[PDB]
Subunit: 322 residues, 6 copies
């Protein structure tokens, strides 16, 4: 089954372990972006994927396109426009010192794009699932409205809608995010959202124990919720457990202890891609949460945004756990 | 003798020798900017310098400021504002393949700045020379008009004005630049301008042999012109010779053959700083052009934007070859 | 215009400049191979390409496959078989000291392969040119035989044949190579071959000034020959000039001086790809040889096997010299 | 408020993780020195600092000076003389293998210096605290007596005295050290001393649980002691807890678990500088000890000798652990 | 006391921490091999060592030889032949991700060797201990029979036989290996072998508790058994404890917690060499097991196959 | 034929190309020293060599020793003593910018040595040639006198004396040097010296054209002189030609243009070892000067102090 996604690619520029911005003489490059990571990760698990996106017509934009080709993501729907690819700087963290990020994504070709450049019948042909996150819709009114527009056209073709809340304080205030999420949520089939999202965006009280049930109660259209519970002990030591709620039941993976941590970035996108894989493969929910959590766990040992492992490697690891 | 400059600092991100953008997995970092480079270079030669500039209040902007501290450039007139430090990417060149650049300087804190945040009584106190380049005035109407205002105030106080043409095609059209240069040129004392500048912006004829003389006729206020003549044989082999015109005569250094080339970036800025150093030390024109060309030559052997050598090292090389 | 090729992919393991094997602590990796480099270089110039080849079903085989995806070479006709990817070690050379190689390509999946795993009608569907080199047919009788079949099949379909003599002493002795070449030569349209080839394989006396006219006389079928004239001054200083002969006239490029030299490997494949490009573009001879020599010259400035430049970048450089 | 310090700068030359001296092909460089590190760290926190020190008038000595500039420590009192900058080699440690050091600091300019080249009225002008360590006074009888002469001039002018025991087996015998310490301690206001110090140098029975109270009885002039309690589990796993004793009370921070460890070097200097910052800002004991332990903890995540964090970053971290 | 060994050297090509094969642009080089590592590690502890082995006459073969010179192993019995040095690729593991290997050792000079190029009275001259492992004998029948001949001759001379089982499933079948081990075990004095070995090759039921006693009973010729008990929590966290059995008593070290892990490769070879060192120095069994476990644990902190520490350093750590 | 040398090993710490001291964050390590380089280079050409030297008993001293083991130089005559290994820093040079050096060799274990810790009969056993340079004798009166003492014992045993003037202004003034050279020269068989040496230390006038003949006249015991003529165009472009004088003739190699230059350090030592190799192999002078000049030329392409090429590789290059 084929999947389409919508999202911005960024170049991440990272310091080496133990080196602060103020002492760095070189930066490691990684191409990534929430939705693009999900496309790459899905393609790793055998799903043909495609992404509607925008890059500048320069060598840096071309690196982003090359990243897609390398991981076999269809680039037919990459549009060339604007003046720059967005970037961010990441200062490595270890032990007591948390990673630190400086964004430089504003004014990017994507963020500034205001032109309807996609033939929807074409973008959506043969597609089973459409995936997008709250990062994209936060970038601008044009993007919020474009995404809704595309969601609706997809729903009319019976395409399933996957939505990753992915709230980023750095991108918008809780109230604006909330207004926007309330326009998307009634249109979603599969939703990545956790307890914090429940309280901030679903009017759920911090008090309620079964928040997934109350989230479904508010938006009965949502068949399935998925997220990880992360316990941050330090920048080098997390506990990680997958949750997947559907049909009135929460299914949980085993809890993994991850230490040390090579690179947590994209850990969430690995999880998301792995859940969608299980759904598309029509697995039982226990099988899906177990596989997806193993995938996200393994991603933490790999520098860069995307998860390099094939399905067999992930499955084998999930089976050793039990 | 103190020198003040005005300009934007950029972070350069470079590939390693022989590696194209498409295969690079890491980029080397260097902080620089034409006027900032001149400031640093002058500091290395014993001149207290300061710079009026703008950076974001984030760790990346802090990197630019720390670069100034490291090289003993006064930072009291650095202004924090905006959301980003401008950058550019540089793909290494060697042999037949020229270096290649991709700018990402737009929307920088400096470029977007529209606020008069400099106390001029303070900025210009104790100052002997003010230096600025054509890159700064190409960025916006505000910077063009801001530099003009500081210039006029500067002259009022008997401060000498050093102006580096530094036309960049990727910043503006010849016509726009021409109009702007026409506002600055009448205010300049020491001008870094070459043969293509004379044709381009001085309305000088292409045929004319004594361009410096004719440029001076056009703007009699300009006491001295300085440039290098670069012969580009390959990305790894240049010939370099310094020119310095004043009082009706061109003075020229010996011609250096530079090969291979480690990093030509900031080579012009090393020249510019070394010329200014000579003027400030009241050297003769022959001593100055000689010293400055040696400085520029040595810079080509050093990765990054600034010239690491002290006067003695530069002078010993110049007197050597 | 599509091109298909046949050839082995190797992993090159290279020392850094000034570091001999005996002092090296790390080796840089590059994937490459004469035909694959031509494929990749043609793709860089806008020609859809595909390649018939063999790699093991392991992570190292996979790296060769990923190399192809990265550069948009079709991999549908990559076959997975055998036990190892061929490799070779390269010790960098500078100034008086020449580069030095230790091959480790024996027993590669490609070299060992004895199975007819290609559907010829699929492989040649929509193909305007078939390219292959002396390396491939030297590897075994199976490969010589396979190349012959495929050419005869291509020839019947109106497909042009491109052939790189690419004689390698390490792979076979003159006598064997010559008998092999004598089967292919009457079937070639475009031929990369130089004076040593003429003397070695075209039966031409070394006393003949115009060897190209004589080689053409031996084989009136070959519509053009191409090659570079390399003057080795040192490991860091070469002169390079392109030749292209067709219809009774040798056309020459300017002679470039190349110093220093970053990486000469694949310079010949850059030249080949560029010449084929000019042919498929139906350019004039003087334009082609000018373009292709610039391409090959620029390639010397880039680590690894393939030429990273686009057409406009090469053509801009070619037009600067004169 | 302004601080003066006295001490030698060293160039540290470090192997990479997991690489022993016998296999290293490059060494990473860091400039440091107990007192110099304290100066840099104070300056990070807003305190103008200056340092009386000696370096050779050569490019290596210059690196030491440029390190001071970069971190805005006043260099007006750096004296150029002698033949060499002291160095030491540090072999990385991880897990069971402890870091290993080899000093190459004898015969340095600082070590051999015998000249009184500092105008004291200028050196002590506008100063509130003078800081020095047992490292400096161990280097020579000249430095021992020079530090004594300065502290005495300082004390006349109403300046507080900060002393860091910092006993080094490598530098001297306990008894000689003991005798030197007996000259300094009666003269100190703020002492960095642990229980090891208490037993070895303050003649406090190792039975004694409240060693600070006994140390105070011995030296009633000492207003407050400070130190970290370090529990070494391995070279990659330490527990760290700050202690600060003043007017009859010991005040503790939370105990931090640090793992892995990036670079413990200079962690004590980060603690020392943080404590002094708190003393200078007139914070309460519990504030200072909490802030300083956090500063020291974070330093462990950074390669090199100095702490790169600003006050807000440190304060925010400290506030999160509560 | 001098030690001789027999074994193949391989070049290991490794990715850096956190980098998969698919993204690596360079590979770090390490020379090693089970028996070659034991030889180097013994030399580190003051024992003159030598190794019977085969490398190609090319620059890569030469790297293997210079590795031996660097570490003062005698190379008089290195033979040059064949076409290639065997290699393998190692993809780093950290935390949940286990390291992974791709072997490229087949058709190696050592593997394809069929020529008896060693003067045995010279190779064994002045030697106190002969060491070899299950890796060598698995490579070819030629090597199996070569090793047997050499053990036979070594025994006539009063030379002690050290054997490391080192079963590698990739090299041969359980049944094929069982039959080789049966010809060797009756000839062994010091044996590196664990509970899995006891069940797989000594025909002991997985039931028996005191497996070493049962192993001794099967082969009363074996004076000492040694092995580590390793508990893998993750790729970055192992527990490690040494065992040494002799005269009907097992002797155990303290259990070490190792984390993170820099490079576990050659950890067992470090253990083997240190045990042999203790035996040759005539230490008590408790000193030996404690010393060798310390040695093995420290090796985990060092990139590469060999243990760079001297006796004093290892001994100081064991005592602290 | 075996060779003994006497000299100090230094650790060289270098910046990478285009990086000045002021911006470097790491330094590359190379072990070397004029005489130690000669010993290593001779070993590469098949001669068993040994070196009398001193290093500290610490891990840095050990790196110097491991360097010798790796290149098969005998270390039985390395003595451990004192507090530090000498070092120097080298700032890379390219094109117009010459490399720049800062020495940190004073107070080294070797520099400060004052104890006769060598059994001369053992040091010289089996030796055909003894080599030393003006660097060693300049370090202290102890080393000057110790070098003479060893030379004399060597001559009593028919050993040939190879001396490399190698005057270094950093180490001593011309007068003191000349004094010392005047004790050594009457004892030398093979001498590395050029025209500047002739004027400076042989008291030849800068008028004489045939300076070697005049130098021989003064010291007829000197069978042959050898040196390179270097023309420095830039830090990345040198011309190099070898000279070799014997039996009243100067033999010159072809002239090599070297560009770019990877690392000139040890270039002279490569020349010296290759010349000695030719002498020991009893080659004709034209064969020797051609081979040695090629050796020295190839060295310029290799990072570090020592020449990695074998004889066949150098000979093949010379023949082109
Ligand atoms: Cl770690
Ligand atoms: Cl170069």
């Amino acid at each position: 089954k084929q999947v389409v996604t919508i999202g911005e690619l960024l170049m991440r520029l990272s310091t080496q372990q133990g080196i602060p911005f103020s002492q760095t003489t070189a930066l490691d490059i990684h191409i990534g972006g929430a939705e693009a990571n999900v496309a790459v990760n899905l393609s790793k698990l055998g799903h043909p994927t495609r992404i509607a996106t925008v890059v500048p017509a320069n060598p840096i934009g071309k690196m982003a396109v090359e990243h897609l080709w390398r991981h076999q993501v269809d680039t037919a729907f990459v549009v060339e426009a604007g003046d720059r690819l967005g970037t961010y700087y990441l200062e490595s963290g270890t032990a007591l010192k948390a990673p630190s990020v400086v964004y430089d994504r504003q004014h990017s070709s994507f963020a500034r794009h205001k032109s309807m450049d996609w033939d929807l019948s074409e973008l959506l042909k043969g597609i089973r699932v459409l995936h997008v996150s709250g990062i994209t819709i936060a970038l601008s009114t044009f993007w919020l409205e474009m995404v809704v527009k595309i969601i609706r056209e997809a729903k009319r073709n019976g395409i399933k809608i996957s939505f990753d809340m992915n709230y980023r304080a750095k991108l918008w205030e809780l109230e604006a995010a909330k207004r926007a999420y309330q326009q998307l949520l009634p249109l979603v089939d599969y939703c990545s959202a956790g307890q914090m999202d429940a309280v901030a965006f679903f009017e759920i009280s911090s008090e309620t124990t079964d928040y997934y049930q109350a989230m479904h109660d508010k938006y009965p259209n949502i068949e399935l919720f998925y997220a990880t519970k992360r316990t941050v002990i330090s920048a080098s030591h997390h506990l990680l457990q997958g949750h997947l709620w559907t049909q009135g039941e929460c299914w949980e993976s085993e809890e993994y202890a991850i230490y040390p941590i090579v690179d947590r970035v994209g850990g969430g996108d690995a999880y998301t891609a792995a859940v969608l894989h299980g759904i598309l493969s029509e697995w039982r929910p226990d099988e899906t949460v177990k596989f997806a959590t193993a995938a996200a766990g393994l991603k933490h040992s790999i520098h860069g945004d995307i998860n390099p492992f094939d399905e067999k490697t992930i499955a084998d690891f999930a089976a050793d756990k039990s």
